[PDB]
Ligand binder design. Structure first.
Ligand SMILES: CCCCCCCCCCCCCCCCCC(=O)O[C@@H](COC(=O)CCCCCCCCCCCCCCC)COP(=O)(O)OCC[N+](C)(C)C
Ligand SMILES: CCCCCCCCCCCCCCCCCCCC(=O)O[C@H](COC(=O)CCCCCCCCCCCCCC)COP(=O)(O)OCCN
Lengths: 93, 77, 96, 73, 50, 75, 69, 51, 96, 487
């Protein structure tokens, strides 16, 4: 019982959750928890797409890849600072 | 002797790093003729000996530069 | 074509091992060696079209480990360094 | 006692009478299933580089010289 | 247990001959000068900033 | 020895050690075989045309389309 | 020669069903105390200290104060 | 090969001697061929390629 | 002879990105144009010396140069290299 | 509308029909039992079709009242994790029926009663969101396994084997029950959705985490308590012993995922080094103990212990990939260990020795069994291309990203895994043939040949393309890792 298209749950924000008292509205806390992962997966996926950007850049330019991909290398290295749950430097979400 | 092939002509050419020394302007014709000629050692020599002597000159000037230090170190001792 | 370089020895090995009773001690000998020699000829063709015709070949079959930002794929890197060892492995394997 | 055990990969000296007939089928079997591997690969082998000289793989391939830019991946 | 005594000598020759290559100091015996490239030792084509 | 016929009337050994019966009659399938075989076929068909019928809805493709339409907003 | 089972040699039966029950032997002896105190209380403590030290050094590099644990 | 008191050696086949001789002679000639044309390269005298 | 020039030829353009060598640690031209000529052709000298000593020991001068029935330190020299530095002994007993 | 209720009812109907069938009708008992098991397997498979791997909340739920005030009640459901365990539980049991098919005349109908009872019992464990009833069905599996080990044990020493397996479980079970009582008295209910959204006290967190760890460290073999598994596992029938390492071993390890990690976010972090220092030394000590072993069954059980201690490292290392790799390794182990115990039990059902000394040179005969055994040993050998390697590579990745020291000790496990399993393979089916002991012996017939076919196909499928398994549960693992914290 679904439309054939991709689902869309919600994007803006969960209004019920208040950071000052995280355990105050249990109904809205799960919404915040799922929204966190649904927004972090966006960053993970854009990191993946910029990774393929870099990979095809190295696969096209040739020997001059130390001067024609630095604008994307700096866009990759900073994207690994707070991506997913992979290193002890957790992102400040 | 000073180099002349710089910026676009040096970067567009697929010459690898490390062989991009002072006198490497004539490597483009060498690799253009060598690549089409099946890389035969016995078919491409017109454009090779010039590069060999360019590297010869670079090595001998490089050791000439150290000659001065070698003959001046006697002052310290 | 580039997939034939890799998958033909596997296919020959699998069919020889599964049907080593259907083929005699010489049928497998003339079949697997023929498949490996075909792979060697393919490797020589790739060497001619890559080492001299300098244009490396790239591909990706399917994602192996499609976890988060840990993209593992069945792709291969038919590069100038790789094809020399393609020649080295295929020629010697067929001769052996 | 070797005849009793199956030896799926063939016995020690397994020499079927019509081994040539089976080998012809086996070689034909490889060729017929090798075509899907070759045909399915034609939609693959992306090589953006253009060789200085023409290779013989242009007839069955078109994934060369097309994937030039890397701003719309 | 006597083999370990020969083991120490066998590896001792390797490290002992390794130290002897420090006692001659071939680094300063170069007959030429360090290699230099144009454009700040090819700074643009090795990284840095354009 | 590449031209002589083989000295084997039949591949040695019996498949699953089951002696073939007299010629003319079938194999006399066993009680467990039929339900297990039909269940294997049902498993194959369900996992074949069911897995490649489920819409690709996940946290990967949804995030892929979302980040494809969100990375393009750099301005 | 119609027995599919093994012959169950006498000298092998004791070897088999003797190591299965070593509680009687391993009750009180001098070497047991040294072995237990050097490989059941010593090594786990050392590796636990190594792990907590690694966590502390990871914390220091990031700068965050180490957790008590 | 003729038979003796224990060594009844068999002579090598026709193609296992002449082929070996006519293939080894190629290498023997090739050693000097590379010692004449590219020989002057590594001797310390008369460095080739415009030298 | 065919591969001496085409792939080690002071900057051959077929490797492309396959093999990358940093500018700093690139010593190839002065490995050929700065050769003292007293060291380049020396391994041939060790080769011919080894030929001479092997021929002498194993064809003519083998009356004492082959079998050494001394008192001590010579049988153990034979065992030290035959048992390859007792690696199969010390490693086995002390680890496995 | 293929809901979860029917998946549990079908084995109940199968058992009920079998109860009133005369013992003489041995033809019908096996047929109807196998048919019920296969219908249950298909009903579990069809759930994977309609899984809808998109939502963070739980899938099909069934609520049945259990107390007068609806305080706590039977609340079914799967999220992303117990689905695969339900599928594998429904798949292993028909293999259990098939392996014990020839000798059913002596076993009687009581053999299938216990297996089907345990079948829907373990089905009701994985999809049980209510915390207390999860414990009711978590320890309900004591009786079927007790009966299987005791009534149809191989040797007479089975009496002492079952006592350990029982009492060790009861001790931790009641230790957990006390924590459940503390949680219910404090919070008020035991429903999982609510109980995950309650602010706990840090001092209370540690005690309750320890109380859960009292039993969950027994189901997964830990250093202090792992004696029960070999002694009570070598001495069980092959059809029954294949699920002690199949589903009875995945309760506590999976129980950590559902009732420990999201339940106590601030306590697992404080107790992380303790789990590391337990499991890292477990993978070493148990592996070394494995080498100096003679029985054919015990070596596989010890390898299983090492695999579980390895997966425990990757589970408590909270990573989006660590937990997914833990689930993949657990599924792969459930396949491979099951296959290995069938492989070593088919030898016992013909010769009845269970000693590697007697076995030798089994490649010159029964080559098909040798090939199958070699494939499953390679799967246990942790080679890439099989489903296991996908299993522990993610474990190593998750452990190294957090702690560098633990990853090296964990990978020492897969280094040492080549010392006992390969030695067993070369010492059982590749030695010198001896006619003194193994006078005569046959090869695998059509039953055990078909038994390994689903195992082989699933092994290869999840080894070369584990995408679908990871695809179906990326949302749930993401929700589990991100809990309590908001950064
Ligand atoms: C890294 C894991 C990759 C996947 C694992 C498969 C890779 C191959 C593993 C199996 C290789 C063969 C080992 C079989 C056991 C060897 C000992 C043995 O039992 O031999 C048997 C089995 O013989 C075989 O080797 C059969 C080989 C079958 C394996 C063929 C498949 C290999 C390719 C599959 C790889 C996967 C392809 C990718 C899938 C997507 C019979 O040999 P006989 O010559 O008859 O001698 C026995 C003596 N007597 C005659 C008296 C009985
Ligand atoms: C000896 C005779 C044995 C007969 C078996 C077949 C003979 C060949 C055996 C060789 C091994 C082949 C094993 C299958 C390898 C498949 C590898 C790719 C599978 C894959 O990832 O793609 C999936 C294909 O779905 C599918 O259709 C997969 C169907 C596979 C059915 C296998 C049934 C095994 C059941 C075992 C159950 C064990 C349970 C253990 C938990 C869907 O991929 P996707 O999501 O990308 O969809 C795409 C939507 N765009």
């Amino acid at each position: 019982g679904r439309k054939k298209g991709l689902p869309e749950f919600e994007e803006s924000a969960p209004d019920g959750f208040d950071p000052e008292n995280p355990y105050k509205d249990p109904v809205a806390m799960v919404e915040m928890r799922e929204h966190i992962v649904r927004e972090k997966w966006i960053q993970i996926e854009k990191a993946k797409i910029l990774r393929e950007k870099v990979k095809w850049c190295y696969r096209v330019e040739g020997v001059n890849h130390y001067q024609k991909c630095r604008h994307l290398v700096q866009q990759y290295l900073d994207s690994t600072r707070g991506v997913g749950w992979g290193k002890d430097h957790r992102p400040i979400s | 002797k000073k180099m002349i092939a710089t910026q676009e002509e040096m970067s567009a050419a697929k010459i690898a790093l490390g062989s991009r020394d002072m006198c490497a302007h004539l490597l483009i014709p060498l690799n253009k003729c060598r690549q089409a000629e099946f890389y035969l050692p016995w078919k491409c020599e017109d454009e090779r000996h010039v590069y060999e002597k360019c590297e010869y000159e670079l090595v001998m000037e490089r050791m000439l530069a150290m000659k001065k230090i070698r003959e001046e170190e006697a002052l310290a001792k | 074509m580039y997939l034939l370089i890799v998958f033909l020895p596997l296919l020959g090995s699998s069919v020889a091992g599964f049907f080593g009773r259907f083929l005699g001690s010489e049928g497998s000998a003339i079949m697997t060696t023929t498949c490996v020699s075909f792979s060697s000829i393919l490797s020589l063709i790739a060497f001619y079209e890559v080492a001299l015709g300098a244009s490396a070949c790239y591909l990706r079959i399917a994602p192996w480990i499609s976890s988060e930002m840990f993209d593992a794929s069945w792709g291969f890197l038919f590069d100038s360094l790789t094809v020399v060892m393609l020649i080295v492995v295929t020629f010697i394997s067929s001769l052996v | 006692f070797r005849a009793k055990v199956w030896s799926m990969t063939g016995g020690p000296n397994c020499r079927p009478k019509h081994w040539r007939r089976n080998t012809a089928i086996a070689m034909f079997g490889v060729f017929l299933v090798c075509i899907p591997i070759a045909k399915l690969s034609a939609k693959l082998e992306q090589r953006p580089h253009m060789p200085v000289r023409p290779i013989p793989s242009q007839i069955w391939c078109k994934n060369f010289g097309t994937k030039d830019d890397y701003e719309k991946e | 247990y006597e083999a370990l005594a020969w083991l120490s000598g066998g590896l001792g020759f390797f490290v002992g001959l390794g130290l002897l290559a420090v006692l001659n100091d071939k680094a300063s015996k170069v007959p030429f000068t360090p290699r230099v490239y144009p454009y700040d030792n090819l700074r643009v084509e090795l990284g840095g900033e354009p | 020895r590449w031209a002589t016929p083989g000295h084997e009337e039949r591949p040695k050994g019996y498949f699953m050690n089951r002696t073939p019966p007299a010629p003319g009659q079938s194999r006399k399938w066993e009680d467990w075989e039929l339900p297990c075989y039909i269940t294997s076929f049902l498993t194959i068909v369900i996992l074949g045309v069911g897995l490649n019928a489920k819409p690709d809805l996940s946290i990967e493709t949804w995030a892929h389309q979302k980040a494809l339409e969100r990375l393009e907003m750099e301005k | 020669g119609g027995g599919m089972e093994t012959n169950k040699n006498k000298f092998i039966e004791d070897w088999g069903s003797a190591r299965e029950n070593l509680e009687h032997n391993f009750r009180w002896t001098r070497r047991n105390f040294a072995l237990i105190g050097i490989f059941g209380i010593a090594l786990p403590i050392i590796v636990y200290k190594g792990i907590v030290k690694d966590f502390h050094m990871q914390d220091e590099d990031a700068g965050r104060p180490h957790r008590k644990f | 090969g003729i038979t003796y008191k224990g060594v009844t050696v068999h002579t090598p086949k026709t193609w296992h001697t002449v082929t070996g001789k006519g293939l080894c002679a190629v290498m023997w000639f090739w050693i000097l061929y590379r010692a004449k044309q590219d020989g002057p390269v590594v001797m310390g005298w008369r460095h080739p390629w415009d030298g | 002879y065919l591969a001496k020039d085409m792939m080690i030829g002071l900057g051959t353009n077929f490797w492309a990105n396959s093999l990358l060598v940093l500018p700093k640690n690139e010593i190839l031209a002065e490995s050929e144009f700065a050769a003292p000529t007293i060291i380049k052709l020396i391994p041939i000298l060790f080769s011919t010396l080894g030929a001479f000593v092997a021929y002498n020991v194993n064809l003519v001068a083998d009356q004492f140069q082959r079998a050494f029935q001394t008192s001590t330190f010579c049988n153990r020299l034979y065992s030290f290299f035959n048992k390859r530095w007792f690696f199969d002994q010390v490693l086995n007993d002390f680890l496995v | 509308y293929f809901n979860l209720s029917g998946l549990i009812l079908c084995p109940v109907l199968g058992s009920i029909i079998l109860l009133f069938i005369p013992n003489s009708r041995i033809r019908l008992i096996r047929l109807i039992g196998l048919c019920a098991s296969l219908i249950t397997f298909l009903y579990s498979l069809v759930l994977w079709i309609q899984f809808d791997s998109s939502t963070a909340k739980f899938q099909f739920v069934e609520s049945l009242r259990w107390l007068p005030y609806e305080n706590i009640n039977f609340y079914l459901g799967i999220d992303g994790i117990s689905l695969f365990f339900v599928i594998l539980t429904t798949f292993l049991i028909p293999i259990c029926i098939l392996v014990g098919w020839s000798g059913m005349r002596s076993y009687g109908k009581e053999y299938i009663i216990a297996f089907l009872i345990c079948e829907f019992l373990m089905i009701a464990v994985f999809c049980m969101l209510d915390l207390l009833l999860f414990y009711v069905f978590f320890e309900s599996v004591l009786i079927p396994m007790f009966i299987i080990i005791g009534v149809w044990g191989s040797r007479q020493r089975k009496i002492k084997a079952a006592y350990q397996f029982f009492l060790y479980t009861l001790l931790g079970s009641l230790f957990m029950l006390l924590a459940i009582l503390l949680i219910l008295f404090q919070t008020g209910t035991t429903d999982l959705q609510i109980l995950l959204t309650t602010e706990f006290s840090e001092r209370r967190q540690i005690f309750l985490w320890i109380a859960f760890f009292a039993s969950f460290a027994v189901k997964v073999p830990m250093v202090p308590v792992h004696i029960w598994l070999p002694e009570a596992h070598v001495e069980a029938p092959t059809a029954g012993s294949v699920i002690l390492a199949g589903i009875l071993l995945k309760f506590g390890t999976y129980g950590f995922l559902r009732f420990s990690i999201p339940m106590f976010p601030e306590a697992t972090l404080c107790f992380t080094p303790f789990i590391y220092t337990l499991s890292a030394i477990a993978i070493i000590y148990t592996s070394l103990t494995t080498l100096r072993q003679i029985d054919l069954k015990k070596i596989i059980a010890y390898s299983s212990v090492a695999h579980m201690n390895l997966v425990t490292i990757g589970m408590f290392s909270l990573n989006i990939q660590g937990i997914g790799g833990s689930i993949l390794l657990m599924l792969s182990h459930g396949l491979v260990s099951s296959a290995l115990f069938l492989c070593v039990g088919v030898l016992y059902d013909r010769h009845k020795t269970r000693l590697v000394r007697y076995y030798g040179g089994l490649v010159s005969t029964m080559p098909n069994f040798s090939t199958i055994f070699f494939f499953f040993t390679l799967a246990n050998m942790s080679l890439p291309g099989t489903s296991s390697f996908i299993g522990e590579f993610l474990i190593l990745v998750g452990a190294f990203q957090r702690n560098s020291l633990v990853a090296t000790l964990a990978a020492l496990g897969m280094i040492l895994g080549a010392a006992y399993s390969l030695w067993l393979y070369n010492r059982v089916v590749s030695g010198n043939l001896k006619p003194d002991f193994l006078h005569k012996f046959s090869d695998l017939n059509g039953r055990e040949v078909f038994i390994f076919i689903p195992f082989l196909v699933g092994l290869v499928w999840m080894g070369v393309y584990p995408k679908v398994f990871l695809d179906c549960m990326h949302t749930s693992v993401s929700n589990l890792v991100q809990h309590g914290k908001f950064h």
